Design a protein around this ligand. Structure first.
Ligand SMILES: Cc1cncc(NCc2ccncc2)c1
Length: 460
């Protein structure tokens, strides 16, 4: 029975509005409704992994797991295995997988982050799960960010706190946050970003939605505009939105958006908005394709509609050779030529690099770089030809070309990372000098870039 090269992953996000679900929710898991929907001919084909994010979830874990499992069993005739479930207040994540995957899944981690302080600490935050699927690391974040049209900067702050403090994945990757720890990271939830148009335009917006004309609304979507301005979700992707706003509906129908200010809303307007979102970030040159992104039309217990997204994701096998794991494979090496880091910092410490990769027995520390003053005031840290030669555990090109090197640039004075990035070994050639590049981020904000050349030697 061969190991898979690709799996499909279902991501769902639903703010349940503190109400129990209706008796049938299969349309969610089938990617049926509005937007980019799944072909009917696939209805009986199970996804490999289902990741369900809820917000304002009133059910117990037991209650929701029985609904989810019975739903999937009705669709597929498969009894899914529970990988992980984690709940913070009313924010929940469930991961289910086909039983055949049980002995492919390991290193399961869960964590949560509570956002805010005093007044704003006690219901918003995030839950997440990570695990290894054979040779591939997967991370999943369900966040419920701050509500309200005039709180986009709070949402951006909530995002930064979640990616700084959520402790998932390999703890040896100590300079790296969740935006660098996983081959594939999916971040979804009630992100709560709104369509920023004047309150007076509510009925105009409703009109546009009835005509399925979303362009003039999406051009004012706060998540799209903040992403464009590099204020949040830097280096994440989102599929084009082709479904109506998923909030705020009158319950028990989808015929009416309830936008007007009421005592129950704190006298705030809730103009129709795409609160409910799925984004992803995968390592460079790894296969990831969004197959569906949409909302259901027939699940009406909440003031939000459920959102679905599905992906075809590249995975790799748990490689064994005669040599690695547990020794090096002299026949492999990774070399770096003409490398330099450019950093936005005003600081003047010396810097060194750390190279982290599961193709190495342990991380590798470089010598200090040579600081130069760049022509437009920036800091250039030159490594030239001084970087160590990295010694992978396995030299087989079928393994090595699928790997990645994480890079941290650290201060010699504090050993704090000033920037993190990632280089793919999926090169156009071996034994050949080729350009490499990554942006560098810290706390998920841009701090610089690293570029140079690489030369990869495999056993072939
Ligand atoms: C509008 C916007 C927001 N955030 C990032 C970008 N980058 C360009 C891009 C990103 C994905 N795929 C193709 C092109 C663009």
């Amino acid at each position: 029975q061969p190991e898979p090269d690709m799996i499909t992953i279902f991501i769902g996000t639903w703010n349940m509005g503190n109400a129990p679900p209706p008796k049938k929710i299969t349309s969610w898991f089938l990617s049926k409704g509005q937007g980019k929907t799944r072909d009917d001919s696939a209805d009986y084909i199970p996804h490999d992994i289902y990741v369900i994010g809820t917000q304002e979830d009133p059910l117990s874990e037991k209650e929701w797991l029985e609904i989810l499992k019975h739903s999937l069993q009705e669709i597929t005739s498969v009894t899914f295995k529970t990988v992980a479930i984690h709940t913070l207040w009313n924010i929940r994540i469930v991961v289910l997988a086909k039983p055949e995957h049980e002995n492919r899944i390991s290193h399961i981690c869960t964590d949560n982050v509570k956002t805010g302080i005093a007044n704003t600490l006690g219901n918003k935050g995030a839950v997440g799960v990570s695990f290894m699927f054979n040779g591939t690391s997967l991370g999943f974040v369900n966040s419920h960010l701050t509500s309200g049209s005039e709180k986009k900067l709070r949402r951006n702050q909530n995002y930064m706190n979640i990616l700084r403090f959520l402790a998932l994945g390999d703890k040896k990757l100590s300079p790296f946050n969740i935006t660098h720890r996983f081959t594939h990271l999916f971040w979804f939830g009630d992100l709560n970003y709104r369509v920023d148009l004047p309150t007076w335009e509510a009925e105009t917006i409703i009109q546009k939605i009835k005509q399925q004309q979303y362009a003039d609304l999406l051009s004012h979507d706060q998540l799209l505009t903040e992403r464009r301005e590099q204020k949040v979700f830097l280096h994440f992707e989102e599929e084009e939105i082709t479904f109506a706003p998923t909030y705020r509906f009158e319950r028990l129908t989808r015929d009416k958006y309830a936008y007007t200010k009421q005592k129950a809303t704190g006298m705030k307007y809730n103009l129709p908005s795409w609160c409910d979102r799925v984004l992803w970030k995968s390592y460079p040159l790894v296969h990831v394709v969004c197959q569906s992104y949409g909302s259901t039309s027939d699940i009406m217990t909440s003031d939000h509609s459920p959102v679905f997204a599905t992906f075809e994701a590249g995975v790799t096998s748990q490689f064994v050779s005669k040599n690695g794991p547990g020794t090096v494979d002299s026949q492999g090496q990774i070399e770096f030529l003409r490398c330099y880091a450019t950093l936005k910092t005003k600081s003047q410490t010396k810097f060194y690099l750390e190279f982290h990769s599961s193709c190495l027995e342990s991380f590798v520390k470089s010598q200090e770089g040579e600081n130069e003053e760049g022509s437009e005031g920036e800091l250039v840290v030159k490594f030239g030809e001084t970087l160590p030669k990295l010694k992978p555990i396995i030299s087989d090109p079928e393994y090595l070309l699928d790997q990645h090197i994480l890079i941290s640039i650290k201060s010699s004075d504090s050993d704090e990372s000033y920037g993190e990035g990632c280089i793919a070994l999926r090169l156009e050639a071996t034994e050949t000098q080729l350009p490499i590049y990554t942006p560098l981020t810290h706390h998920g904000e841009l701090t610089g870039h690293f570029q140079g050349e690489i030369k990869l030697q495999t056993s072939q």
